[PDB]
């Protein structure tokens, strides 16, 4: 046979501290539905000194989707095999591409992370590429997720922003697939992280996440807003969650959706979105009792309210920076 | 300032002979329009003991196209930049993907090659990825290329198989593009190889090609049909050129197109395809005088005619190895 030795490529940050990388490294992949707390959790991990996640890469989910189109089509599958493009070849190529993006698009760290929501649809395949990677699947009440998508007009291919029922059916199908991928991998490899629980109990849930990842505790994860303020956590000013993740963990988004779902969909909730009850969200409750907030997050929420003017300044400065760029795009045309 | 070293990954096989590989290796990229002699020239190189090209990969040009779709769309280019996906990052990922495919889909060799026709539309970008790669651009009379496409019903996105004029205009645009890329790189990097001249004068043209690539002459390149017969050259039974390249270099396809172009297109030829004259093909001639055939290729042509029943058998065995697969594809239904 022929064997392909891939020694460790590496990263040198300042002071020549070496950071080797290969497919066997203990990567962290975070995903789930868009608008389910995925940026929050990756920013809380970025706040840890040992972990770097950084911004959404966009190219990783797009490559994974294109690869699915190839191997799903029987004729193309056969053409690839007859060209020598076996699974072993395609996996080597895909893993190399993905690993280069993760390594190079941010600063080095002892543990590297990626967050691109729909990568968790491909978690079983990513475990084949990266055998020691671990996965965090964000879970959030589908009614909150769809309310966010619709009120913030987040564009997702195939989501009809005029239609709550259609978006909840899409949410339901996506989460059925992602939850199944997660459980196929099992608890040694994939941890479901419940958004409302993480918000209500950030110290206990961050402890649980860090234990699962085998990363020591650090209180720095409870001060992520300060590290954003001094550019210690990388954000894209074009991502839609930036103006929320700049704030401390807070209670404001748990149940904003209540009373904004059309009555026929509230009636049909259990049939429209059966993943709600499967995941622990009562489809008859508007809202469920997600639990009692820790004093830490009650205090954060009160302090944000006291600084409402400071925060609205930052949220407007952000939309201003969004405006400069949509100028630089009408000028690129 | 972050430095990213990538030590030589390598191949080893029988006797543990090491073959290191990285982006600086002297790769060979072959391309041009489909139906221009690209499989012939890659098979003549495969006949050299130092060079391995192998079958079309398909995924390499498809990834190149997807990358162009990203960077050319101004909104998407801005989102990538604000995610940290700089050209430096994207180039590292693209080069890693393409290199893994080239290395792993075939047997190892001192010099690795790839042939996928439309990669040469991206030759300037590939030189950025692989600075010591060299390029061969096949050139063939556009009338012969379009006749082949239409008569053999070769599906190419955007080519109307019922319309010679439209196909010749597509050919003309594609070759203006590929020829421009080749000349941007210049003669130290890209050699135009004329199909009709390679067929008429194989010893002198293969001398020129091998000197350009810095590979020593070997008479094996004039015996490629024998090396196919003992499995020293990899062929896809699903590629449309396999039944032609199994024969010795021969004269039968130089001017088959003559008398098969609609009258009105013949009358308008210089206006329909101005690239013909630019490349040296007289658009007023049906056919141009491509030159005088070497006696080597005249003799090959005569011998093929003598063994026509032996060649008909292999052509049939290829069509039947095709139907076995087209059964296995409707079985996937």
């Amino acid at each position: 046979n022929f064997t392909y030795v891939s020694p460790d490529r590496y990263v040198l940050g300042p002071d020549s501290r070496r950071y080797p990388y290969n497919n066997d490294m203990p990567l962290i992949f975070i995903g789930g539905m868009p608008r389910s707390g995925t940026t929050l959790v990756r920013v809380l991990l970025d706040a840890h000194p040992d972990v770097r996640c950084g911004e959404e890469t966009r190219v990783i989910p797009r490559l994974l989707s294109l690869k699915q189109q190839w191997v799903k089509n029987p004729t193309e599958m056969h053409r690839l095999l007859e060209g020598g493009i076996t699974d072993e070849v395609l996996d080597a190529a895909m893993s190399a591409f993905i690993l280069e993006v993760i390594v190079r698009h941010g600063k080095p760290a002892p543990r590297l992370c990626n967050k691109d929501p729909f990568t968790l649809r491909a978690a079983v395949y990513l475990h084949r590429l990266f055998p020691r990677a671990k996965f965090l699947l964000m879970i959030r009440d589908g009614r909150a997720v769809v309310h966010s998508i619709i009120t913030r007009k987040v564009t997702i291919t195939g989501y009809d922003l005029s239609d709550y029922r259609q978006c909840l059916k899409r949410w339901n199908a996506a989460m059925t697939s992602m939850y199944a991928q997660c459980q196929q991998l099992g608890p040694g490899l994939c941890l479901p992280v419940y958004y409302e629980q993480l918000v209500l109990h950030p110290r206990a849930w961050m402890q649980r996440i860090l234990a699962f990842l085998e990363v020591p505790w650090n209180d720095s994860v409870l001060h992520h807003e300060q590290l954003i303020n001094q550019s210690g956590i990388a954000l894209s000013k074009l991502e839609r969650s930036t103006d929320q993740v700049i704030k401390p963990i807070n209670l404001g988004a748990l149940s904003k959706w209540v009373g904004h779902i059309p009555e026929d969909v509230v009636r049909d909730m259990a049939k429209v979105a059966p993943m709600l009850a499967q995941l622990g969200y009562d489809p008859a409750a508007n809202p469920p009792d997600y639990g009692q907030p820790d004093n830490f997050v009650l205090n954060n929420t009160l302090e944000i309210k006291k600084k409402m003017e400071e925060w609205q300044a930052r949220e407007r400065e952000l939309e201003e920076h969004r405006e400069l760029i949509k100028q630089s795009i009408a000028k690129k045309k | 300032n972050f430095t990213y070293v990538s030590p030589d990954r390598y191949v080893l096989g029988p006797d543990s002979r090491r073959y290191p590989y990285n982006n600086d290796m002297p790769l060979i990229f072959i391309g041009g329009m489909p139906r221009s002699g690209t499989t012939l020239v890659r098979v003549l190189l495969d006949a050299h003991p130092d060079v391995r090209c192998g079958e079309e990969t398909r995924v390499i040009p498809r990834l190149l196209s997807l990358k162009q779709q990203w960077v050319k769309n101004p909104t998407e280019m801005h989102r990538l930049l604000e995610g940290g996906i700089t050209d430096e990052v994207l180039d590292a990922a693209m080069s890693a993907f393409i290199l893994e495919v080239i290395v792993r889909h075939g047997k190892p060799a001192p010099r690795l090659c790839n042939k996928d026709p439309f990669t040469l539309r991206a030759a300037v970008y590939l030189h950025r990825l692989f600075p010591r790669a060299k390029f061969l651009l096949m050139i063939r009379d556009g009338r012969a290329v379009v006749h082949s496409i239409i008569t053999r019903k070769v599906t190419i996105t955007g080519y109307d198989l019922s319309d010679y004029r439209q196909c010749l205009k597509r050919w003309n645009a594609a070759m203006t593009s590929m020829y421009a890329q080749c000349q941007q790189l210049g003669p130290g990097l890209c050699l135009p190889v004329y199909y009709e001249q390679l067929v008429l004068h194989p010893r002198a043209w293969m001398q020129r090609i091998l000197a350009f690539l810095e590979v020593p002459w070997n008479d094996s390149v004039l015996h490629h049909e024998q090396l196919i017969n003992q499995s020293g050259i990899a062929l896809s039974k699903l590629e449309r050129s396999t039944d032609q390249v199994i024969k010795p270099i021969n004269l039968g396809a130089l001017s088959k197109w003559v008398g098969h172009i609609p009258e009105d297109v013949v009358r308008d030829m210089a206006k329909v395809a101005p690239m013909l004259a630019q490349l040296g093909y007289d658009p007023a001639a049906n056919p141009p005088d491509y030159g005088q055939p070497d006696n080597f290729v005249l003799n090959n042509t005569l011998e093929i005619k003598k063994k026509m029943e032996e060649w008909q058998a292999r052509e049939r065995e290829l069509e039947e190895h095709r139907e076995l697969i087209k059964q296995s594809i409707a079985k996937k239904k």
Partner: peptide, 6 residues
């Protein structure tokens, strides 16, 4: 391109 694609 949309903000996201499944």
């Amino acid at each position: 391109f949309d903000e996201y694609e499944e």
